[PDB]
Amino acid sequence: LAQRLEGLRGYLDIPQKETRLKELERRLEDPSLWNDPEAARKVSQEAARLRRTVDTFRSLESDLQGLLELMEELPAEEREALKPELEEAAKKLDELYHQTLLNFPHAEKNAILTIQPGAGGTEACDWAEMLLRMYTRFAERQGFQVEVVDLTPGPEAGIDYAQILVKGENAYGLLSPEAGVHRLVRPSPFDASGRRHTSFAGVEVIPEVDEEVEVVLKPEELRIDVMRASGPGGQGVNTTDSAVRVVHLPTGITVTCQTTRSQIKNKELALKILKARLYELERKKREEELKALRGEVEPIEWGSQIRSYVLDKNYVKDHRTGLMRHDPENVLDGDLMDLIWAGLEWKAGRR
Amino acid sequence: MLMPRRMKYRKQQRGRLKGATKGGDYVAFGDYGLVALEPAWITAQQIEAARVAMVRHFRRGGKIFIRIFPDKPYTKKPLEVRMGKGKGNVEGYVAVVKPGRVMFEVAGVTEEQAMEALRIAGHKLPIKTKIVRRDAYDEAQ
RNA sequence: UGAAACUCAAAGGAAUUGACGGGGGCCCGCACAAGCGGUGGAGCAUGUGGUUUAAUUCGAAGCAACGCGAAGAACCUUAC
RNA sequence: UUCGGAUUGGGGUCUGCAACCCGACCCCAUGAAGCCGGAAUCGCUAGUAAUCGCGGAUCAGCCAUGCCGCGGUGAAUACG
RNA sequence: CCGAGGGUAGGGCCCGUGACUGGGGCGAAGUCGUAACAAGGUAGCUGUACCGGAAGGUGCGGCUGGA
RNA sequence: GCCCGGAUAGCUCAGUCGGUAGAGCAGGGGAUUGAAAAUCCCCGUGUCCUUGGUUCGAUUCCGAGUCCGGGCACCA
RNA sequence: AAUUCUGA
RNA sequence: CUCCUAAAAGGUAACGGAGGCGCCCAAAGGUCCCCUCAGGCGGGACGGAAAUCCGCCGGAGAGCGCAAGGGUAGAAGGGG
RNA sequence: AUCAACGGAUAAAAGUUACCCCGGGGAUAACAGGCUGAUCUCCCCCGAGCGUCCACAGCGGCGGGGAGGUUUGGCACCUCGAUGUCGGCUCGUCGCAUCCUGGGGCUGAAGAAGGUCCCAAGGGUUGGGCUGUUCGCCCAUUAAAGCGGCACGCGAGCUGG
Ligand SMILES: [Mg+2]
Ligand SMILES: [Mg+2]
Ligand SMILES: [Mg+2]
Ligand SMILES: [Mg+2]
Ligand SMILES: [Mg+2]
Ligand SMILES: [Mg+2]
Ligand SMILES: [Mg+2]
Ligand SMILES: [Mg+2]
Ligand SMILES: [Mg+2]
Ligand SMILES: [Mg+2]
Ligand SMILES: [Mg+2]
Ligand SMILES: [Mg+2]
Ligand SMILES: [Mg+2]
Ligand SMILES: [Mg+2]
Ligand SMILES: [Mg+2]
Ligand SMILES: [Mg+2]
Ligand SMILES: [Mg+2]
Ligand SMILES: [Mg+2]
Ligand SMILES: [Mg+2]
Ligand SMILES: [Mg+2]
Ligand SMILES: [Mg+2]
Ligand SMILES: [Mg+2]
Ligand SMILES: [Mg+2]
Ligand SMILES: [Mg+2]
Ligand SMILES: [Mg+2]
Ligand SMILES: [Mg+2]
Ligand SMILES: [Mg+2]
Ligand SMILES: [Mg+2]
Ligand SMILES: [Mg+2]
Ligand SMILES: [Mg+2]
Ligand SMILES: [Mg+2]
Ligand SMILES: [Mg+2]
Ligand SMILES: [Mg+2]
Ligand SMILES: [Mg+2]
Ligand SMILES: [Mg+2]
Ligand SMILES: [Mg+2]
Ligand SMILES: [Mg+2]
Ligand SMILES: [Mg+2]
Ligand SMILES: [Mg+2]
Ligand SMILES: [Mg+2]
Ligand SMILES: [Mg+2]
Ligand SMILES: [Mg+2]
Ligand SMILES: [Mg+2]
Ligand SMILES: [Mg+2]
Ligand SMILES: [Mg+2]
Ligand SMILES: [Mg+2]
Ligand SMILES: [Mg+2]
Ligand SMILES: [Mg+2]
Ligand SMILES: [Mg+2]
Ligand SMILES: [Mg+2]
Ligand SMILES: [Mg+2]
Ligand SMILES: [Mg+2]
Ligand SMILES: [Mg+2]
Ligand SMILES: [Mg+2]
Ligand SMILES: [Mg+2]
Ligand SMILES: [Mg+2]
Ligand SMILES: [Mg+2]
Ligand SMILES: [Mg+2]
Ligand SMILES: [Mg+2]
Ligand SMILES: [Mg+2]
Ligand SMILES: [Mg+2]
Ligand SMILES: [Mg+2]
Ligand SMILES: [Mg+2]
Ligand SMILES: [Mg+2]
Ligand SMILES: [Mg+2]
Ligand SMILES: [Mg+2]
Ligand SMILES: [Mg+2]
Ligand SMILES: [Mg+2]
Ligand SMILES: [Mg+2]
Ligand SMILES: [Mg+2]
């Protein structure tokens, strides 16, 4: 975490790529099309900031006993001159490390976890309820406004569904790696002979985004024809352009209407339908987008877990990274800040 | 936008426009102002669409004084409906404006930005306007 | 009259020993019934779930865990 | 209510280095809820139940109304 | 004359394919109820008939692998 | 567009001459259960859609508005 | 005339 | 029936703007005699921000059974 | 007496007609014209802001001014002693607000291609599938497969879906 942060950042890698930036940089090769220039210095600052990183490390490493003299001498100034450059250091130590992780699209949004009990029927419905209390307490004590969306207390035990809001900053970026399958091994409190069975669950997580609903269509967005309606009407139907036709060029969807004898009221009913059928293509694409934001995994059956929890052998093995703690009880109650970082490191690794 | 929040009667007669303002011929607020040359009913939509045209031009600057207020209910019969059968329904609101009326006036800005933030608003009005700066009539002795 | 693909490591007969029966016969126990005094209500003591907390140390969980380890927690104890 | 003694203010003794969290008592002043307890539900067949008081272990003190003992008074009912 | 073969017309068999649809096997977790195994909580099963979200129910006669 | 009828607890719905406010369901606390259901006690929350007015007071009686339910839009 | 009890 | 439209007499149309009436009082009627409001500011146990009191200031903004208008306390209003 | 249709026809009364009829009306609707131009089509003013940069290569928020007389309307002026109504076919002709082809300025025009505005109708502007269709969509092309006015041209020229 603190002592380890360095390595997994391109600690030795970056400091070699860094000069590759400035590499092609100099020698203005007919600087025509603007491209690297942008991500030229910004990618550079990253570099020599691994020194500010080894300075806040050294200033924080030369700080291990950087108070051995303050354990022998309390009053002075030659000992309060580097300190105003040491308090700020223990700050960036965290900064240049968690500002390298959360470094992705939209995380600072309020999150929305969802818990659905996988296999194991009733066990899973309960193990689900426990997984609920977990993030809750966590996010709760973590300084996050927690709003309960849903809670469907299933059949015999536990729940069937749960969805809650995570009001705060980077709430999503935090409770994001959690998204996935969570297994639970322990003798079934439900089973008869307190036998040993395995439980599964699903925990989805997504950023809060859409709040409004706007669907207005510019005139040029469409096209309106008018022709003589087909049907009864004697001279009328014959010599009037009562029949309308709205066509939305982009989608190609078109609507026709000869309902009433008024070209006018028919345009009205027309668009009225057109809109309706436009929101349907608007919501059809409004969800094929946000649903591809759930993932591409989680069959919620066996062998899909990404971190199991055991209680009759006290431990918690995170399959994703390999990490394995020995305090299931602590994890299931808040303790997460450990596996959350790591969870990211693993992930953000490929981007 | 910009309409009353009351009035005793929802719809009122069309009235008539016999020239020369009833008042508001002198500029009694800001430095430079805008005065109407030809009679007309200015719409709520127009007043606003010029008030912004104004600010937007000189963003984060002086103060604008709107001295006309649309308190006349403007009506109109639906489309394709025939004559009679009661008075049309309200469309929006207008403000009566006769020749000489100082509609607008800006304050706390350079004449450079005055005789411009006005020239623009003028193009948003259905009538001819002219610009003026405080002069003859002042409230003193 | 009468198949197949596909799929399972069994399907199945009888007879054992038990367990079980809103099967039977026989028979016990404050099990009911007969009777007396309580609990649930109230204020307080204590144990526990829970929540809260920097921590509110751990265990016990139906009967057979909950005045149980505790036949003595101000610091000791004491594990937080 | 001369029932019932919660809560609270004020004054004190004692143990302990020290009792604000957190001690047990003492005295003055407060005097709360509670007019026999819904659905339910426990114990006991005789010196038993019910009822009264005492002792010990623990232990400086003590949150014991707990636990383990001792005796004093002394029932009801059991067809089946 | 016959004649390989080519064309024309209509048949028969088999293989492949088809929007949709029928029921089937399998599937360590759903929803509904609980039909059968103990007088299985209306003894069960059976050929057939009618009915019903579903097991199933009921009628008629048959068997006992039930009383 | 016209003309009827609506909106009341979380869902489905009663209710009054103008002062009041409800039922069945869901839901919370208890009880039997080994544990659920069922069953059994205890429970409560509503501007009675919005916005005006009349009244001393409006869920209630009138104006208007929004959403939903019906019925018509015919001769050419 | 009173159901249900998954999966090591 | 009341206002406006209606162009300072009266009158004046439109499927023009906006509302009321189809009753009511045995006192809400005659007359005689008294009385004067609504509000606002301070003061006052319960007391809203108007219950009933007290004191100043208040020319009619109150009241007049119900729509609107005119009228009106030098009473048409309040009481006997 | 809700004779409330409120100067009150009887004491006493609803529908339907595409099976219809007569008397009347262009005093009055449906077609066409007319007047109007809200709607429609085209044009322009302003310049927020877009266009990596830069208001105007290409665009134009809020607002504003017009033109045309193709559409849906408003009105009800000739015509009800009759002005035959859709589409197709045939025959065309006029407009320009140009779909090709001829000229030309800009360009975010390298070139070939395009885009936008200007000038310019001389002549051109295909064949089919579906539908009564106008309108549209599609197939196969093309230099292009223009938009309108002519009583939505044309039934004493035809068809009659
Ligand atoms: Mg589920
Ligand atoms: Mg759900
Ligand atoms: Mg017809
Ligand atoms: Mg027509
Ligand atoms: Mg305001
Ligand atoms: Mg004059
Ligand atoms: Mg055979
Ligand atoms: Mg056998
Ligand atoms: Mg027996
Ligand atoms: Mg005994
Ligand atoms: Mg009690
Ligand atoms: Mg342990
Ligand atoms: Mg514990
Ligand atoms: Mg103790
Ligand atoms: Mg310690
Ligand atoms: Mg103390
Ligand atoms: Mg009792
Ligand atoms: Mg007692
Ligand atoms: Mg031959
Ligand atoms: Mg076949
Ligand atoms: Mg069967
Ligand atoms: Mg059964
Ligand atoms: Mg049975
Ligand atoms: Mg049964
Ligand atoms: Mg049968
Ligand atoms: Mg039956
Ligand atoms: Mg039978
Ligand atoms: Mg409701
Ligand atoms: Mg009440
Ligand atoms: Mg009820
Ligand atoms: Mg309950
Ligand atoms: Mg319960
Ligand atoms: Mg209630
Ligand atoms: Mg039952
Ligand atoms: Mg079930
Ligand atoms: Mg089982
Ligand atoms: Mg007059
Ligand atoms: Mg006059
Ligand atoms: Mg007063
Ligand atoms: Mg008060
Ligand atoms: Mg009189
Ligand atoms: Mg009198
Ligand atoms: Mg009569
Ligand atoms: Mg009559
Ligand atoms: Mg009459
Ligand atoms: Mg009659
Ligand atoms: Mg017929
Ligand atoms: Mg005939
Ligand atoms: Mg006939
Ligand atoms: Mg006849
Ligand atoms: Mg005739
Ligand atoms: Mg005429
Ligand atoms: Mg005439
Ligand atoms: Mg006409
Ligand atoms: Mg004509
Ligand atoms: Mg515009
Ligand atoms: Mg024309
Ligand atoms: Mg016309
Ligand atoms: Mg006329
Ligand atoms: Mg005619
Ligand atoms: Mg003639
Ligand atoms: Mg003729
Ligand atoms: Mg030209
Ligand atoms: Mg070129
Ligand atoms: Mg053809
Ligand atoms: Mg055809
Ligand atoms: Mg032509
Ligand atoms: Mg024609
Ligand atoms: Mg025909
Ligand atoms: Mg024919």
φ, ψ of residue A6 in degrees (nearest 5): -45, -80
Phi-psi region of B80 (alpha: psi -120 to 50; beta: other; left: phi over 0): left
Beta strands A111-117 and A145-152, pairing class: unpaired
Question: Which stretches within B41-110 are classed as H helix?
Answer: 44-57
Select from A329, A318, A333, A308 the least CA-distant residue to A134. Answer: A333
Q: How was this structure determined?
A: X-ray
Select from B8, B15, B26, B19 the least CA-distant residue to B94. Answer: B15
Q: What is the DSSP letter of A151?
A: E
What is the distance between the alpha carbons of residues A339 and A351, in angstroms, rounded to a whole number?
A: 19
What is the distance between the alpha carbons of residues B137 and B24, in angstroms, rounded to a whole number?
A: 11
Quickly count: other Cβ atoms within 10 Å of residue B128's Cβ: 12
Query: Could you tell me which residues come within 8 angstroms of residue A231 by beta carbon, excluding any fewer than 6 positions away?
Result: A237, A258
Query: Could you tell me which residues come within 8 angstroms of residue A312 by beta carbon, excluding any fewer than 6 positions away?
Result: A185, A186, A187, A196
Beta strands A183-187 and A308-310, pairing class: parallel
H or E segment and range at residue B132: strand B129-133
Query: Could you tell me which residues come within 8 angstroms of residue A193 by beta carbon, excluding any fewer than 6 positions away?
Result: none
Question: Which stretches within A206-262 are classed as H helix?
Answer: 234-239
Contact A120, A197 (CB under 8 A): yes
| Site of tokens 């322990």 | A186
How far lies A70's CA from each of A85, A115, A164, A218, in Å?
16, 51, 48, 72
Select from B16, B5, B26 the least CA-distant residue to B93. Answer: B5
* Terminal-residue alpha carbon distance, chain A: 21
What is the distance between the alpha carbons of residues B34 and A125, in angstroms, rounded to a whole number?
A: 73
Can you spell out the DSSP letters for A300-335? Answer: -STT--SSEEETTTTBEE-TTT--EES-HHHHTTT-
Q: What is the DSSP letter of A197?
A: E
Number of H helices and number of E strands within chain B?
2, 7
Contact A284, A251 (CB under 8 A): no
> What's the alpha-carbon Rg for chain B, to the nearest Å?
17
β partners of residue A202? A116, A181
Q: Angle at CA A31, nearest 5°, toward A26 and A33?
A: 135
How far lies B45's CA from each of A256, B78, B82, B92, in Å?
34, 20, 27, 8
Q: Which residues of A touch B80 (CB under 8 A)?
A: 262, 264-265
Q: Does B80 touch chain A (CB under 8 A)?
A: yes
Q: Is A294 helix (H, G, I), strand (E, B) or coil?
A: coil
Contact A88, A150 (CB under 8 A): no
What is the distance between the alpha carbons of residues A139 and A145, in angstroms, rounded to a whole number?
A: 8
Select from B62, B67, B58 the least CA-distant residue to B119. Answer: B58
What is the distance between the alpha carbons of residues A258 and A171, in angstroms, rounded to a whole number?
A: 53
Query: Could you tell me which residues come within 8 angstroms of residue A192 by beta carbon, excluding any fewer than 6 positions away?
Result: none
Q: Does B79 touch chain A (CB under 8 A)?
A: yes
Q: Does the CB of A235 fall within 7 Å of any strand F atom? A: yes
| Site of tokens 């009833």 | B22
Question: Which stretches within chain A are classed as H helix?
Answer: 14-25, 38-48, 52-61, 89-98, 122-141, 171-174, 234-239, 263-290, 328-331, 337-348
Nucleotide closest in space to A118 (CA vs C1'): E29
Q: Does B81 touch chain A (CB under 8 A)?
A: no
Q: Which two tokens stand for residue A189?
A: 């409190």
Q: Does the CB of A232 fall within 7 Å of any strand F atom? A: yes
Contact A298, A202 (CB under 8 A): yes
Quickly count: other Cβ atoms within 10 Å of residue B132's Cβ: 17
Maximum pairwise Cα distance, chain A: 111
Q: What are A's interface residues with B at a Cβ cutoff of 8 A?
A: 262, 264-265
Beta strands B63-66 and B102-107, pairing class: antiparallel
Domains of chain B and any CATH numbers: 29-137 (3.90.1170.10)
Question: What number of residues does chain A have?
Answer: 351
Question: Which stretches within B18-90 are classed as H helix?
Answer: 44-57
Q: Does the CB of A122 fall within 7 Å of any strand E atom? A: yes
Q: Which two tokens stand for residue A293?
A: 């934001």
Phi-psi region of A298 (alpha: psi -120 to 50; beta: other; left: phi over 0): left
Q: Which two tokens stand for residue A162?
A: 């749960």
Select from A250, A293, A238, A295 the least CA-distant residue to A274. Answer: A250
Beta strands A183-187 and A196-199, pairing class: antiparallel
Separation between the CA of A83 and the C1’ of E50 (whole angstroms): 96
What is the distance between the alpha carbons of residues B50 and B120, in angstroms, rounded to a whole number?
A: 8
